[model samples]
Target: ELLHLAPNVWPRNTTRDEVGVVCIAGIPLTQLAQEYGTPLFVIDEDDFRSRCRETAAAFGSGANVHYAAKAFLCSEVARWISEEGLCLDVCTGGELAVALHASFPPERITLHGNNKSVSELTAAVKAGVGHIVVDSMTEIERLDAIAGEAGIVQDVLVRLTVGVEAHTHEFISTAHEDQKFGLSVASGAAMAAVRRVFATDHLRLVGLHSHIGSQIFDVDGFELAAHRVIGLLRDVVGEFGPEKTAQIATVDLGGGLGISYLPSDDPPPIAELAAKLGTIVSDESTAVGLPTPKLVVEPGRAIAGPGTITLYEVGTVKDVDVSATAHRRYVSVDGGMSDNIRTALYGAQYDVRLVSRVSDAPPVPARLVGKHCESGDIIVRDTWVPDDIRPGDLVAVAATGAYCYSLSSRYNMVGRPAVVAVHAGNARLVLRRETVDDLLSLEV
Candidate 1:
């Protein structure tokens, strides 16, 4: 009966025991709760590294796979990526610091940001980072000056707004011409920036880069993006002779590969995505009579999203009557927007299950909420759970390894949760839970 009720929305290693408890990586959810408390993120270390390996293989041996740190980053995760033979993409000095702290090679890091401060550029140059994706005219000048001062030639990829509006949430859609992220390809600002980089002695212009958007499920948008970017590359070579563009040897297609959040979602396979993109890029390069440049993909969510789960304990269960003979069951957990804000921020959906125990009772429409003061503080806005779900039950939200912890906050002064990595039947704490003292340490 418990096996019949098990939700298919969990990680690959997730399985139900004979007694009805769910286990991940051969460790029971009950054990994780007992040791780490509620409001924890349990990551399958093997699963994460496996995804990294799969992405690297799909992109082929010559291509570079840089895991975007914005989706999730810590010393442990950085180490895992490095060990898996993948590079790291960090957007800020803090993320770079984390990567360095983990002993990740500087040459394996690619720095990104539109408004990077002088200090940030200086740090990247001093650290000898492999590439910097220059986003603005000002940033190019700043990076050039910094590298010149350091007596080093810095390699850079010009971030181009290819004017492709990927079918994703408005907030995350980056490559649209209206966004502030990259230079507009339609407006010729991208070309102007590329030209300026060529004039700088200390900067080596490598290639073009574009991040269409996040949570992308198909290859059509990426194919279109590659077409536009490669067209620009052809124009670059035509306008400014190949003699000047000799160092442009790579094109970075920023990652937004989506993962399954709900049972109904069928995200495209990584292998298929890689194959389609390779064909499109090769065809475009061939048509333009240009050599196929080395490929680089920065995937964050795709490699991390499905490898972790957020565990929360039920705090309150209430059935509020909305209409005659109709009601909405509000199941409040110990954590809410503080731990996972995608629901409130982007209306993101998730699939949750009673991991501590299973119920034979029929399913009921439920609203899984968090213990925040704001009514808008919801985790799983709508999900079907066992009708017998009650306080003290442990619930696990699937595929929360992406932005849940990275974007978490100390809202209502609530301490953030810990992150545990489970593998080979061992559960280890990668990040500890924040205490009240840790929060108050900043106050006067």
Candidate 2:
């Protein structure tokens, strides 16, 4: 059962010690816990880099693969992205600054945001980012003005809201969309923005970009987005000659490539997704007789989300009733919503395993909760644990490497956890545990 998630989500070579201790690159979680304390995040360095490299290869050398830094960004992680031959996608000035601090090549950075401030645009322009995804009409005007003042022609992509809604397993195709992310193509806003970009002398229109939604498993939505975008490209080629249309020489399909979150969920293989996307772009571009533009994908969770686990130390154990004549167990760990909010926020379920030892006792249905004051502070919504499980046992939650810490908060004044990267049986701290001093450091 453990092996179900062990191979694909965890490191490809992950194994358990004789005592049932989870080890990555032969580094034990128990030992890491002893050194780092409870509520620790352990990332398999080899696993992360392998996934990043794999994505880069799958997207091909000529195509652009931008790692969404919002999934999780630290100086060390940013360094990994740079080393992995993938660009960085940052939607805010702060993310851009962090990537800059890590010395990520400015030419490989793609700036994206619905509301980029004037100062942010100026800083990005000065930094010489590869391109900015233009989100609104006002931004196009504002960015052109900024670039004019800076005496530079900034390359940009007009973000089109294709009005395709994609959630976990369902697809909603609509001609009219109301969302916050991009200008809608169904409402003619996409074409309008393209025309504006074409007319602007200070701005260089690089391509058209569309992001439907997140947590999507459907390939049709991406196909639809690509067709609609290419159709616009065809129309542009008709109105303006190939030279003018060739200026829109790129298309970002956006990133909603899904990952398995539940026991029964099965996402398509990465290679399959890539191939399908390639076919759609190829087949559609051929039919339209338009030059094939370079494709770009900005994946956040698929590359980084499953390569790390959150290790928490159990603090309390309780037996609670499940039915009129039956009962279930509840295990509480030291950290919860402060560190991981997915379970509470998204009703997400995480699989947990005992990392310290294997018990002979029979397994029992159990719920893992956190020490936070809120009732929804759950780490694992439901799980099966040994009947003899006790406090001080190590709990390792899988698939937390992505949004957990990045969107974490200081709720209940509990300090944040430390982040450690394990490689070749060696472990080192990437982020130190938040201290009381750290919290107070923000204050006067």
Candidate 3:
């Protein structure tokens, strides 16, 4: 039954050895566990690069594809994206610094943040970033002043909230008029921002950008967003004249492409998404008689999520009774919310496998939990593990490559796990595990 799970739930290069040990990119998880210890994040480097290259090809050579760094960012990952010819989207100074440290081209980095600090803006200006996605009126003023002071015309994209409430978790959705991100189109704020940009000589308004939500599975939301944004572009062309419209040469459809998480999940492929979006933009522009602006997409999870898995060692097993004829089994691992908090934060689901060795024991209902102090620190709320599962057994959780490590914390002072990338049967650590002194060093 576990093997029958959807293919998207695991890494593309995942395979099983003769002894039933799971291997990713030809490197067995048993060897990984033995060398690296429990609570490790194992990424398939080949799978990661393949996804990056596939996304780049799907968008074509003319369009811009920026890998959203908030999903996951490290020196090695940044370099990999650069090598694949994909631009990088960073929301904070720290992310920008990482990309810069990796020697990624400064002109290909897009700086994004709803509330960017003055210091961050100054740094971005000095670095000559490709584009600064302006989110607020204050940010526009700040960037304009900083750029003018530095004797440069900063290129920018005004973020617009198209009022399209995507069908996704409320916390992750952003296009709704109520969210803190983007200027609201329905309220005239977006137009006002555009006008404000035009009034400033130090800023160049290249296009409009919008992101509906994260973990989106359908094209309906994207289509509507494109329709509304192009509608605004039509108004801009009519009001600002053809010259300004010609100057407005780009439309950034912010990335929210979802990946398969559960066995039942069905996410659209990158090629399909690229074709659909291209068709939509062309159709809308032709309908309005406006020039088809260049398209840009920022995909984070879609590129990172399926390329990695979290390996944990089972520590304890318990069966708790809820009713006369019902009981729930709990399988605890060495790590919890500190390493992967999606299950607790967003009620996310994941597939698990006993990777150390296959068992003939019947499948049984179970809850995979972590060592966190809170009861909500569950990795998988409900699933089926082998009935004979016990301590010291190794388990692998699929589809954790995106936000797991990026959002990881040192809660309860539990050290975070190391991140290792496996390729062609060779495994090497990209990010080392946290240590007791590493956490204590922060204390005064």
Candidate 4:
């Protein structure tokens, strides 16, 4: 069975066979490698769908579930998300085009971006997108003019910075002061934008939105954001009354939920978060004499991150000296920064396993490095691997489903790997391997 990052978050469909083979969805790891090849991303589609259904059901009727398209999107994947009874969140025209190509329902889409160009805005307007998230005052006027020309009232949400930001494993208090994402609700910029949207005849201010940050493990930031956003709504109503600004019907708590990359981590459950938020908003709105707005959450990584793993073939091993009493093993793999950059870029940590066979040798402190020319091309910065693990052995790194492919780069002229979806003793390629010709095709 798959391991849950937390109790509320869904666990993936993973298991160890009788022979100690790592099998996701009842398909042996060795078999998947033989069929689709190594350096492949194996996603448990069953795990992904379960997470989506849980969140949608938790929110129940009238609550919107918009899949953050930037987290990872292909036409096929988009179709799967659409079929799961959720909406789509697009941050750019390119993403919108992908959703449009897949024929996702227009009303199930919400456009988001900090700085959208006129072309992008026009494309969204012409396409009849569901909601356009307004980020800046300049965009407010720009979209107002765009909608006036189109002769339609555009539904919009003003992004607000509630002065909260949370990073991997921890939350920082002062992260929202000067961020690029949204107008500061603490600094009056958020309310100014609301008034401006109210004055625009073609723009309908539908709600307030905020994304504290990524890799958030606590609901404190979410609660603080909700309280502040609802307080603003009460204040806006107190001055202008809710009926005058009848367009604002909901408040969006943008996704920043955390997931465990290491085996030791246990993030908070979704039910706890949903329940805590439900009470906070319900009580706060009642005190303020305003109706309870629909509670919306956009979690991408928490759902998709843990459902996949990266399979790489070990290439070399060596012993390195740090001090007289300390030694570390260097285990190099065929795929490194090119396939996964989180470890090297931000010092992200992960766990590795010797999946080829059972290791009789004792484990040692190992630094998993890549085959790249640069020394900084590391994968798992620090982890324990089988001492006997050597060249040509398969190594499986867990918890790489979210950012690896989205942030992957071809740094050494090395082509990127393929991706496979495995479920119930079956597998199929979702993304094909990039060849040398594919790389050279961009040349003049």
Top candidate on lDDT is 3
What is candidate 2's lDDT per residue for 67-115, written digit by digit as tens? 8888899999989988888888998989999999999899889999999
Once fitted onto the true fold, the runs of candidate 2 whose alpha carbons sit more than 4 angstroms away are 1-5
Alpha-carbon local distance difference test for all models: 0.85, 0.84, 0.87, 0.80
* Model 4 regions more than 4 Å off: 1-11, 61-63, 168-170
TM-score for candidate 2: 0.96
User: Against the hidden reference, what TM-scores do the models get?
Assistant: 0.96, 0.96, 0.97, 0.94
Question: What is the TM-score of candidate 1?
Answer: 0.96
Give per-residue CA lDDT, model 3, range 1-444, as digits (tens).
554535778898899898888898898899998999889999999888988888888888513889999999999999888888889999998998888888888888999999999999999899989699999999998999999999999999999888776544333234446768998887778888988998999999898898877777777888888998988888787788877776878899898888888867777788897898899998998898888888889989988989889999999999989789987889999999998999999888898888898888888899999998888889999899988899999998999999999999999998879999999879999999999999998789
Error of 3 at 322 (Å): 2.0
Cα lDDT tens digits for candidate 4, 322-440: 89999899998878899899887878888777776666777788899898999898998888877787888887888777778888788888787899998777898989998899999
Q: TM-score of predicted model 3?
A: 0.97
lDDT agreement of model 1 with the native: 0.85
Candidate 3, which ten residues in sequence have the lowest lDDT sum? 167-176
Clashing pairs in 3: none
Worst 10 residues of 1 by lDDT: 167-176
Candidate 3 lDDT score relative to the true structure: 0.87
Instruction: Put down candidate 1 lDDT per residue, 56-133, tens digits, no spaces.
Output: 899885138989999999999988888888888899989998898888888888899878999999988888897999
